[PDB]
Design an enzyme around this catalytic site. Structure first.
Site, PDB file in Angstrom:
ATOM      1  N   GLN A  10       0.709  -1.025   0.253  1.00 30.24           N
ATOM      2  CA  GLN A  10      -0.047   0.018   0.419  1.00 30.24           C
ATOM      3  C   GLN A  10       0.555   1.323   0.257  1.00 30.24           C
ATOM      4  OE1 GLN A  10      -2.392  -1.199   3.888  1.00 30.24           O
ATOM      5  NE2 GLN A  10      -1.338   0.401   4.326  1.00 30.24           N
ATOM      6  N   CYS A  62      -5.467   0.534   2.934  1.00 30.17           N
ATOM      7  CA  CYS A  62      -5.671  -1.392   3.280  1.00 30.17           C
ATOM      8  C   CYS A  62      -6.364  -1.627   2.958  1.00 30.17           C
ATOM      9  CB  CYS A  62      -5.690  -1.474   4.894  1.00 30.17           C
ATOM     10  SG  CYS A  62      -6.658  -0.938   6.107  1.00 30.17           S
ATOM     11  N   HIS A 110      -6.162  -2.087  10.836  1.00 31.47           N
ATOM     12  CA  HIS A 110      -6.302  -2.369   9.899  1.00 31.47           C
ATOM     13  C   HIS A 110      -6.934  -3.393   8.921  1.00 31.47           C
ATOM     14  CE1 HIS A 110      -2.792  -3.036   6.853  1.00 31.47           C
ATOM     15  NE2 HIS A 110      -2.198  -4.382   7.171  1.00 31.47           N
ATOM     16  N   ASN A 124      -1.371  -9.961   3.818  1.00 32.89           N
ATOM     17  CA  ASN A 124      -0.426  -8.447   3.990  1.00 32.89           C
ATOM     18  C   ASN A 124      -0.552  -7.739   3.070  1.00 32.89           C
ATOM     19  OD1 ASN A 124      -0.662  -6.253   5.721  1.00 32.89           O
ATOM     20  ND2 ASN A 124      -0.263  -6.928   7.454  1.00 32.89           N
TER      21      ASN A 124
END
Ligand SMILES: *[C@@](O)(CNC(=O)[C@H](CC(C)C)c1cccc(-c2ccccc2)c1)CNS(=O)(=O)c1ccccn1
Length: 215
Positions: A19, A25, A162, A182
């Site tokens: 990102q 996110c 997140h 992630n």
């Protein structure tokens, strides 16, 4: 539901992305759940446009943040979302440049997994594929993760800071877990990933904000 599932070995997951500086996110969590559903539908694995979401989901906050359910909703109303190729990620806020000839997929809505219910999240991953989740990712131990089934008593299930993606679940060494993709780059954690404690009273808030798009 199966004892363990991993949609990576099933070709549902696209590469780990980064990102950068932008608070996107949520966009990467949404795009990942969208890519999993597109794969199941057409048999092709394509990278979808988080920039498209950041610039166009007016209900959200761009690089300031937003919700996954809003993004599924924009794709549904808008009748589509562009590919990464057609709408590359820049990492900062710019005007909506959604182009329909670059439409890579569509959404018919979204489903929300019962808050705080892990078994439910499991059935959802098991029967649907990758699932958009929100966790507490503020703890240092989480940010310095490299191996193992992550777990910490300090994790706060009401501090959801997140957005991430539930890519499957299973067991490591007697430790049940969730395979979490992630958006911090393939250089973070375990090649972009982290296994997070499963069935441990909904650790870090793993099941408090889960949802998946219909396609
Ligand atoms: C991510 O990049 C940006 N954060 C967000 O989108 C959150 C919501 C997520 C589901 C967790 C957020 C913050 C503020 C406002 C809003 C919002 C919602 C709707 C409409 C408008 C605004 C949403 C965060 N990830 S991070 O930067 O890697 C990070 C930050 C903090 C701790 C750990 N990691």
């Amino acid at each position: 539901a199966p004892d363990s599932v991993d949609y990576r070995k099933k070709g549902y997951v696209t590469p780990v992305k980064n990102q950068g500086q932008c608070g996107s996110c949520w966009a990467f969590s949404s795009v990942g759940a969208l890519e999993g559903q597109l794969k199941k539908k057409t048999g092709k694995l394509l990278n979808l446009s988080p920039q498209n979401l950041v610039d166009c989901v007016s209900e959200n906050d761009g690089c300031g943040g937003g919700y996954m359910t809003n993004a599924f909703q924009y794709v549904q109303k808008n009748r589509g979302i562009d590919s990464e190729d057609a709408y590359p990620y820049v990492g900062q806020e710019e005007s909506c440049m959604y182009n329909p000839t670059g439409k890579a997929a569509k959404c018919r809505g979204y489903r929300e997994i019962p808050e705080g219910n892990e078994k439910a999240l499991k059935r959802a991953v098991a029967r649907v594929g990758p699932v958009s989740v929100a966790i507490d990712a503020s703890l240092t131990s989480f940010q310095f993760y490299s191996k193992g089934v992550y777990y910490d008593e300090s994790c706060n299930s009401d501090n959801l800071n997140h957005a991430v993606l539930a890519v499957g679940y299973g067991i490591q060494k007697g430790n049940k877990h969730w395979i979490i993709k992630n958006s911090w780059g393939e250089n973070w954690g375990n090649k972009g990933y982290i296994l997070m404690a499963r069935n441990k009273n909904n650790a870090c808030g793993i099941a408090n904000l889960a949802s998946f798009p219909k396609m």
